[PDB]
Nucleic acid binder design. Structure first.
Length: 178
DNA sequence: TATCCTAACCAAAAGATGATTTGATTGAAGGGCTTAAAATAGGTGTGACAGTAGCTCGCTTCGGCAG
């Protein structure tokens, strides 16, 4: 069962369609937090402090946001960006919001011998300290990928909802323990 | 005496014992990646694709007579 350590999400990724054509130069010109360098890439970057997120605009009518601590918070950040775009004069809308990715991390408070983890589970766990100290572990139920380290801390990524990260942690905990 | 030994000591060669200064090492931080995923958005170059690029028979010529 659980050890009292609940995995905590550190990032969310989400996108939404603005539903209208936009001009990147106009956004960069009229907005304070907007960043635009067409010589490098054809998109505008947006930053706000509450939520603590980073997002982008594209002329084809697309918006992406990331950096939030929860999917509801990511939606709030996206809607704030949509409001900013609307008040800048574009006829934007908040259409087809989708959560794309969310990351989590946890710990077990005991060492994990990665040698044992690889030599019992070589079929889906890949271990290669030289380029990456941690052990890389992919899984099917749910479609998640993990990073397991010597200290016992684990990073979880690829989920759409916190339930997936929780159940992934519960699935791996008996493997981590023994 | 004129000098040498070497108790005790001055001057110096050298031999040693410790205190201070400076060359060398490294502790931690400036820093700056990392694979794992997930995503929208994009620009074009270029590199494959293809194409062309030791012995025994047969055959020929130009005179030397024929007609």
């Amino acid at each position: 069962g659980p050890s009292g350590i609940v995995p905590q999400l550190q990032n969310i990724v989400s996108t939404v369609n603005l539903g209208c054509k936009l001009d990147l130069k106009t956004i960069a010109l009229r907005a304070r937090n907007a960043e635009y360098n067409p010589k490098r890439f054809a998109a505008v970057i947006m930053r706000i402090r509450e939520p603590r997120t980073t997002a982008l605009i594209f002329s084809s009518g697309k918006m992406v946001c990331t950096g939030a601590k929860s999917e509801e918070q990511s939606r709030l950040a996206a809607r704030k960006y949509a409001r900013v775009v609307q008040k800048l004069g574009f006829p934007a809308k908040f259409l087809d919001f989708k959560i794309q990715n969310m990351v989590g991390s946890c710990d077990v408070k005991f060492p994990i011998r990665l040698e044992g983890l690889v030599l019992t589970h070589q079929q889906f766990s890949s271990y290669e300290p030289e380029l990456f100290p941690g052990l890389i572990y992919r899984m099917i139920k749910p479609r998640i990928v993990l990073l397991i380290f010597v200290s016992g801390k684990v990073v979880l990524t690829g989920a759409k909802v916190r339930a997936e990260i929780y159940e992934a942690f519960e699935n791996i905990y008996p493997i981590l323990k023994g």
